[PDB]
Design a protein around this ligand. Sequence first.
Ligand SMILES: Cc1cc2nc3c(=O)[nH]c(=O)nc-3n(C[C@H](O)[C@H](O)[C@H](O)COP(=O)(O)O)c2cc1C
Ligand SMILES: Oc1ccc(Cl)cc1
Ligand SMILES: Oc1ccc(Cl)cc1
Ligand SMILES: Oc1ccc(Cl)cc1
Length: 364
Amino acid sequence: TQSLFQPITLGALTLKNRIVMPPLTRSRASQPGDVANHMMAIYYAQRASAGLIVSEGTQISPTAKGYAWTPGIYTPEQIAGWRIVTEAVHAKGCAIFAQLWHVGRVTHPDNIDGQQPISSSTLKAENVKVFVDNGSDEPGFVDVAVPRAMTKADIAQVIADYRQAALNAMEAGFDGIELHAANGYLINQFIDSEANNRSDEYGGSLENRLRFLDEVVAALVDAIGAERVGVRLAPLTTLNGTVDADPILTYTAAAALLNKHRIVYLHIAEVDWDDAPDTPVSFKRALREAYQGVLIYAGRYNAEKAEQAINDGLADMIGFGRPFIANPDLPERLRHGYPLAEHVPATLFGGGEKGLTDYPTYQA
Ligand SMILES: Cc1cc2nc3c(=O)[nH]c(=O)nc-3n(C[C@H](O)[C@H](O)[C@H](O)COP(=O)(O)O)c2cc1C
Ligand SMILES: Oc1ccc(Cl)cc1
Ligand SMILES: Oc1ccc(Cl)cc1
Ligand SMILES: Oc1ccc(Cl)cc1
């Protein structure tokens, strides 16, 4: 755990340790308005012993939302709500990035103002469900709708929304933003070959499939600086059903592309729930060469595996998702080998402070 508790520079920031609280959707946003709120500020501040916190996915526009009660980052109220969160976190001495979210085809019209979902293509995410609370029917999971393929104008608009969302994040006092390009959401729907059947310059070739990622990142960097832009990829998991034919190649290329932008960190999601594909060390070694910034991994890490990943030269920082839910003082527990509480799946999403802010710190 020695390396794990070494500080690290992240752009202009000097982080206290190598531990990341990765994005964790808790769907606690105040209704109506999907506004980041007090319990969320407390929740994040409780966990501010992390070296870096990355917020739960936060939708960049009304049509970017996939799930009921997730916080937005496009209205003045939403920005103000996030500001209280970032101030609460900053009061503790911690860095926090906003994960900018566009779910693309992984949504339902009820979650996006009756609009049709957008995507690279008109392919539905098969067997994929999102959660809806439309005010009329009893809230619950529903099948995603069929998306429409983005036009060049849609692409320009979404890039605009990402760019503005980044400015909004800075206005909300975030230290940076993380582009959610993972888990089968909008950008992932362009990247992964089986989710992209476009015939224009945004589909087909590997270079084309990465074009949307390229242009979104260009915008983000232009807006707030590369030192404040991170990106998250999930090369091998297939959460929400985007599949690539050659993920090892696609994502090593993507890492190289992102390296050209000099994004401050690349965040690799290795595991999603029980979707834990073998991530070859040789792949990780290739990513380490393709991308020369701060490399973050999350997925079933414990203290031992985290430390080894760092000492092996594979990772610079390690995210702990589920353990951070149930252990606000996760770093302290990891350092001392204190037993980790386990989270209650039933209170992961929705509800109030219960299962959010009432996981106690460790007490012998
Ligand atoms: C309840 C929950 C919500 C999550 N929300 C997000 C999300 O908003 N954005 C994202 O990129 N990953 C999300 N993830 C994935 C986690 O960030 C993390 O990568 C994953 O849980 C694997 O790490 P772990 O085994 O330490 O939990 C979420 C995971 C869980 C369990
Ligand atoms: O946004 C969400 C996601 C999952 C659940 Cl159970 C409720 C709301
Ligand atoms: O610009 C702002 C607004 C609110 C707070 Cl707490 C701090 C800075
Ligand atoms: O990327 C994501 C987003 C939301 C959730 Cl619940 C899990 C993973």
